[PDB]
């Protein structure tokens, strides 16, 4: 009962895997633009789209990033031809007059700092979900990484900005032995119930 055809199902989900090694082949800016142009449409609360991205391309910036990556993740991050650092824009409310223009008081739903931060991180995580699918849609492999120090990455790449660094995503064509055996997924009956 799926409308999405099987080949698309395989590319995005069924045969898509997290890459642990990458080919060094350069990933072009035009490639990432095409991915963003596709998945920017994925919905966020009040269209608030708080995700901001820094493409850590140069060896210089990659070495600066690696000092904040846990040792067990440095192999992958160092070998990826492209690394995306995602941060949640804590000033997203200021964009709502133009992004959610028919509710002019929308920004004020987030006057509380905790509510603003929690909404920024939640919708940036939502967008990370879209982004992972978008990377796969671009024929590439995604290797998300949470084992890093967000404060150091903030100082390094977003100094003085009102953001919350949330994620690192290795992007590239897979290298040799990039994939380990698929791990378990919970059964439907363990996850879903009806009332």
Ligand X SMILES: Cc1cc2nc3c(=O)[nH]c(=O)nc-3n(C[C@H](O)[C@H](O)[C@H](O)COP(=O)(O)O)c2cc1C
Among residue numbers 74 through 103, which ones bind a second copy (CB under 8 A)? Answer: 95, 98-101
Among a second copy, ligand X, none, the one that 73 touches (CB under a kind-dependent 5 to 8 A) is ligand X
What do you get for the CA distance between the two ends of the chain, in Å? 22
**Using the rule CB under 8 A, is 117 a contact of a second copy?**
no
**Using the rule CB under 6 A, is 48 a contact of ligand X?**
no
Closest approach of Cβ 39 to ligand X, in Å?
12
**Using the rule CB under 8 A, is 170 a contact of a second copy?**
no
**Using the rule CB under 6 A, is 147 a contact of ligand X?**
yes
Q: Choose the binding region for ligand X from 58-66, 106-114, 143-151, 155-163 (rule: CB under 6 A).
A: 143-151
Q: Which is nearer to ligand X, 143 or 157 (CB)?
A: 143
**Using the rule CB under 8 A, is 188 a contact of a second copy?**
yes
H or E element at residue 151 = helix 150-157
**Using the rule CB under 6 A, is 46 a contact of ligand X?**
yes
Among residue numbers 57 through 96, which ones bind ligand X (CB under 6 A)? Answer: 73
Q: Is 103 annotated as a binding residue?
A: no
CA atoms within 13 A on the CB side of 57: 9
- Give the tokens for residue 176: 């040799």
Residues whose CB falls within 8 Å of the CB of residue 154, separated by 6 or more in sequence, listed in order:
87, 161, 163, 164, 165
Number of residues that bind ligand X (CB under 6 A): 15
**Using the rule CB under 8 A, is 160 a contact of a second copy?**
no
DSSP per-residue letters across 119-138: HHHHHHHHHHHHHHHHHHHT
DSSP per-residue letters across 133-184: HHHHHTT-EEEEE--B-HHHHHHHHSTT-SEEEEEEEEEE-B-TT--PPPPP
Q: Is 185 annotated as a binding residue?
A: yes
CB of 56 within 8 A of CB of 85?
Answer: yes
Q: 10 Å Cβ neighbour count for 59?
A: 9
The mark string for 36-55 relative to a second copy (x by CB under 8 A, - otherwise) is xxxxxxxx-x-x-x-xxxxx
Binding residues for FMN: 17-18, 73, 76, 146-147, 182, 185
């Amino acid at each position: 009962p799926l409308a999405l055809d099987e080949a698309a199902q395989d590319l995005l989900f069924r045969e898509a895997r997290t890459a642990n090694t990458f080919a060094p082949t350069h990933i072009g800016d035009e490639h990432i633009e095409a991915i963003y142009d596709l998945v920017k449409w994925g919905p966020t609360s009040m269209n608030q789209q708080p995700m901001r991205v820094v493409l850590v391309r140069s060896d210089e910036s990659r070495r600066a990033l690696l000092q904040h990556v846990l040792e067990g993740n440095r192999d992958k991050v160092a070998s990826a031809p492209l690394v995306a650092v995602l941060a949640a824009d804590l000033s997203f409310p200021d964009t709502l007059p133009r992004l959610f223009p028919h509710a002019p008081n929308a920004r004020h739903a987030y006057a509380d700092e905790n509510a603003r931060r929690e909404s920024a991180v939640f919708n940036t995580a939502l967008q990370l979900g879209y982004f992972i699918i978008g990377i796969r849609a671009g024929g590439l492999a995604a290797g998300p990484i949470a084992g890093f120090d967000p404060e150091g990455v903030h100082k390094e790449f977003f100094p003085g900005e009102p953001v919350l660094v949330t994620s690192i995503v290795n992007i590239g064509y897979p290298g040799p032995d990039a994939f380990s055996a698929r791990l378990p997924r919970l059964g439907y009956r363990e996850v879903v119930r009806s009332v």
